[PDB]
């Protein structure tokens, strides 16, 4: 039980940590993708202007 207790607590902490990491990284990837797309639209504007 005590062994099971420690196993359970450690696994739960590891799981919550991984979840928080992946969620925040998902937010980051969203932000960087927004950067990319908005920059692409700037690229299209510039292309039209130059042509």
């Amino acid at each position: 039980l005590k062994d099971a207790q420690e196993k359970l607590e450690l696994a739960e902490k590891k799981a919550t940590d991984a979840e928080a990491d992946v969620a925040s990284l998902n937010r980051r990837i969203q932000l960087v993708e927004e950067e990319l797309d908005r920059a692409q639209e700037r690229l299209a504007t510039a292309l039209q202007k130059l042509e």
């Binding site: 937010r27 932000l31 960087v32 950067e35």
Partner: protein, 52 residues
């Protein structure tokens, strides 16, 4: 002949003046505004409130 030529010349002179010198009143409007970039610096917000 010179009188007739100078009549038309003087008549067109004032029209040219009005057409051209008045352009100098303003020509900077061609200049565009800043249109600044963010450089991944304006990413300082979460999905907390969106209506405002």
């Amino acid at each position: 002949l010179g009188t007739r030529a100078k009549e038309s010349l003087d008549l067109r002179a004032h029209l040219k003046q009005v057409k051209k010198e008045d352009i100098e009143k303003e020509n900077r409007e061609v200049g565009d505004w800043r249109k600044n970039i963010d450089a991944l610096s304006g990413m300082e917000g979460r999905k907390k409130k969106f209506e405002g």
